[PDB]
């Protein structure tokens, strides 16, 4: 028979990332990931159509990415932009139609935490392919939020504008992050965020927050984001 075992889960915050891996010895194409918490019976998160496609639950489509390496009898599931509601234990038995369920692994656990001037946060170190979430508090006691934008800068190089959101909720991203980055407001708390998926060694920079208030343009001190594994 097969012995399944899965590892790589951990504690992480809003946004954030984690690479779950899984492995077996004793067809690796028929493996998908289940998820279980207490108080609601376990569900399926990723499965396989008979033809060989990889169908993902709509609640997560656009975050979790099933990869595989036949050469190591290993399957993975790269998680980005992790939400609190992703908290549970993930298993690794099969998910193609018409296949026997393999012997249950123990499961790796996955937990997810949570003079006007601006205040950035969230910056940290991650691996290539990871995901962060930066936030931009204004420190005003809700005096004015306005229209903002995020610009980064590696040391000794010219600044780069990455993404912006105006008052009208229009978004524009640079071609250097096209597809990967996503700027959302979250207005209910007077803070504005930037989700950063699929990072590279090339994003290693100090990320700041500009707002252009009355008269002068303003920024915050900005947080490091490093990616070199």
Numbering used by the authors: 1 to 26, 30 to 117, 128 to 242
Task: Please quote the paper that reports this structure.
Results: We describe crystal structures of four unique bispecific VHHs that engage and activate the cytokine receptor pairs IL-18Rα/IL-18Rβ and IL-2Rβ/IL-2Rγ. These bispecific VHH molecules, referred to as surrogate cytokine agonists (SCAs), create unique cytokine signals that can be tuned by linker engineering. All four SCAs crystallized in a dimeric conformation where the two linked VHHs interact to form unique antiparallel VHH–VHH interfaces with their complementary determining regions (CDRs) pointing in opposing directions in all structures.
In DR3085, the entire linker between the VHHs is not resolved, but the C- and N-termini are about 27 Å apart, which is compatible with the 10-residue linker in this SCA and correlates with its maximal activity. Consistent with the screening data, DR3085 drove the highest maximum IFNγ secretion, followed by DR3097 and 3087 (21%, 15%, and 8% of the IL-18 maximum signal, respectively), while EC50 values ranged from 0.01 nM of DR3097 to 0.7 and 1.8 nM of DR3085 and DR3087, respectively.
